[PDB]
């Protein structure tokens, strides 16, 4: 069954704080608790540990990744990397 | 008094102060039923009464609240075995 | 306290110099405990036979102090 | 039924005031003050607990014989078996690559 | 408290000693007015204050 039409995970807050505030928290909370894919291992075992820190499970790639507060990568970081790579590849040649 | 209560006396609606959940947690009933059904599925597989393909379908069916008790599971297995052997008899003929 | 499971092992500990005394304890179940007091440990050997107990008692060093409980 | 008291003057449920109940040969119920539980040494590369070594408080390790505190292998008692295997293979392959890069530099 | 320092314990010993009756022959001396003393301390009444 659905159990909620709108509030989703934010149902824990009940009727407090205002709908817009709960909706904004809802979008972020879905992001920060999601599973993401490890580029180094290929498994979807990447979960957050405290705000910019994303860890991996298993016997392989027990590494920790520095990421965004609520998602593994940010758009600003992704755009910076390609900007940096372009600049690196143009002084290289 | 306890001997009488063992036979079912002194247990009507006028003798209950806690909720049904306070008296008997529904999570305990579910945990007991699941452990009973899983043990039965494991016993049947170990004896060859069911194979791993049917065991897997029944395991996920039991997790999804398909069988109210051991009897409902046993009849369902008998129905499934009767149908599968029918297809085998149809194909072998 | 340490248990000794071999009669040969018990006799060797008795022949040592730290072995001051021995104790004989006769249990109700007709089993006999030989207890050897060294400096650090008390060594018990359980003998379940009366014939074996007599032979073991005779098998002890002659100068060993064997005390009866 | 029988109720118990702390055997020391420490009156609070701290981590140094751990207890468990014993029944004595006098039919007495009383506390026994016990230590914190030991810890198995952990691998320096992976953090996994190291096999073959008991869980003891730090100073209890000073009483064991040498071989109880280690494993008969390189980095035994300091690295796990799979960590050592990664180190050996990594060291060999990296050294070989240094050999080819030196050969192709001339 | 029974947890006490040595210095505290020494003071308690002294306090107990001064908390005694005077022997009568002290007050029987010619020219002595030691007959009664205002230094009889009692534990519930007047506190030592360390």
């Amino acid at each position: 069954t659905k159990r909620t039409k709108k509030v989703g995970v934010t149902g824990k807050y009940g009727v407090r704080y205002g709908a817009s505030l709960r909706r904004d928290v809802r979008k972020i909370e879905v992001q920060q608790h999601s599973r993401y894919q490890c580029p180094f291992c290929g498994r979807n075992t990447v979960k957050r540990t405290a705000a910019g820190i994303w860890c991996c499970n298993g016997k392989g790639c027990k590494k920790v990744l520095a990421g965004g507060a609520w998602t593994v990568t940010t758009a600003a970081a992704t755009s910076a990397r390609s900007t940096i790579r372009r600049l690196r590849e143009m002084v290289e040649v | 008094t306890h001997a009488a209560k063992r036979l079912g006396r002194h247990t009507g609606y006028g003798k209950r102060k806690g909720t049904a959940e306070a008296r008997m947690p529904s999570t305990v009933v579910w945990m007991r039923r699941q452990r009973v059904l899983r043990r039965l599925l494991r016993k049947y597989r170990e004896s060859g009464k069911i194979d791993k393909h049917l065991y897997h379908t029944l395991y996920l069916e039991a997790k999804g609240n398909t069988f109210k008790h051991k009897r409902a599971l046993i009849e369902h297995i008998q129905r499934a075995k009767a149908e599968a052997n029918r297809t085998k008899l149809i194909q072998e003929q | 306290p340490r248990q000794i499971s071999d009669i040969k092992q018990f006799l060797e500990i008795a022949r040592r110099k730290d072995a001051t005394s021995a104790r004989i304890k006769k249990n109700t179940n007709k089993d006999v405990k030989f207890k050897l007091r060294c400096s650090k440990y008390l060594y018990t050997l359980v003998v379940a036979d009366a014939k074996k107990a007599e032979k073991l008692r005779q098998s002890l060093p002659p100068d060993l102090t064997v005390t009866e409980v | 039924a029988q109720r118990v008291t702390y055997r020391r003057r420490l009156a609070y449920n701290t981590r140094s005031n751990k207890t468990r109940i014993i029944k004595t040969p006098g039919n007495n119920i009383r506390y026994l003050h016990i230590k914190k539980l030991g810890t198995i040494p952990r691998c320096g590369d992976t953090g996994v607990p190291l096999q073959g070594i008991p869980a003891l408080r730090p100073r209890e390790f000073a009483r064991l014989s040498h071989n109880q505190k280690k494993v008969q292998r390189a980095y035994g008692g300091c690295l796990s078996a799979n960590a050592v295997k990664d180190r050996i293979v990594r060291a060999f392959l990296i050294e070989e690559q240094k050999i080819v890069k030196q050969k192709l530099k001339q | 408290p029974s947890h006490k320092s040595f210095r505290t314990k020494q003071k308690l010993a002294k306090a107990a000693r001064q908390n005694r009756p005077i022997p009568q022959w002290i007050r029987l001396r010619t020219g002595n007015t030691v007959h009664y003393n205002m230094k009889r301390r009692h534990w519930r009444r007047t506190k030592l204050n360390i």
Binding site: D24, G52, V64, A66, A69, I84, L87 | - | - | - | -
Partner: protein, 248 residues
């Protein structure tokens, strides 16, 4: 009147709560290897630092002069991971996480933990999600122009070092705190600055805003730059006030 709250923030109960912090986040002392070449370090841990939004990275370097390993505490850039190799020095490559003199990186590169003076070990663009942009170089008397997160343009010597990439910890301030208790926990590990009583909620003895038979300031809240302590409250040396509609 009495000493106002702002004047009491001089120490004491207003010191930073630093028990749970593992170390300051610093670049590495500018040494021979970084001045002339590069040196390689390996990311050992990426850790949470109480009171700081961004995560920190513990990076292990070999000591060039002694048989020993030196651990450095860096502000983690986004993309960094444990086991990564980072390279610091003049000849380090332009890869996220490496530390280079700003004069060695092209115009437009995104950097973080940038030095104001060559060797100060990192001052600019350090909080979560922030960075500095290289704007241009002036090779004659080497000075590099950079854009700061505030929007200011600054001139640093072209030997001040910077870390390639943006500080990790992303868009932290995008999430509503939603509750007093969450603000409580955020400042509990920082300093004794929360909650805050309004000046107009006070009595005249307590604050220049205090008193009156309604809660009101009385005089203008834009106070001069050269106000004495105890009267320097409200909007200090404000160029303007009010809701801006289009700024630069």
């Amino acid at each position: 009147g009495r000493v106002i709250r702002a004047q009491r923030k001089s120490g004491g109960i207003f010191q930073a709560h630093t028990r749970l912090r593992k170390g300051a986040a610093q670049l590495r002392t500018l040494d021979f290897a970084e001045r002339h070449g590069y040196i390689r370090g390996v990311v050992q841990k990426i850790i949470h630092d109480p009171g700081r939004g961004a995560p920190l990275a513990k990076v292990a370097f070999r000591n060039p002069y002694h048989y020993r390993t030196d651990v450095e505490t860096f502000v983690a850039t986004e993309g960094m991971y444990t086991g990564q190799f980072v390279y610091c020095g003049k000849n380090a490559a332009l890869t996220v996480g490496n530390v280079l003199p700003v004069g060695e990186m092209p115009e437009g590169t995104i950097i973080s933990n940038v030095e104001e003076k060559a060797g100060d070990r990192g001052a600019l663009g350090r909080s979560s999600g922030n960075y500095v942009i290289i704007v241009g170089h002036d090779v004659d008397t080497g000075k590099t122009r950079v854009k700061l997160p505030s929007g200011a343009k600054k001139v640093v010597p072209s030997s001040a070092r910077g870390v390639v990439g943006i500080v990790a910890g992303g868009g932290r301030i995008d999430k509503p705190l939603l509750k007093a208790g969450r603000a409580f926990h955020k400042y509990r590990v920082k300093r004794n600055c929360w909650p805050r009583t309004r000046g107009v909620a006070m009595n005249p003895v307590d604050h220049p805003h205090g008193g009156g038979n309604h809660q009101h300031v009385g005089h203008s809240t834009t106070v001069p730059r050269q106000s004495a302590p105890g009267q320097k409250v409200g909007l200090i040396a404000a160029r303007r006030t009010g809701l801006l509609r289009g700024a630069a």
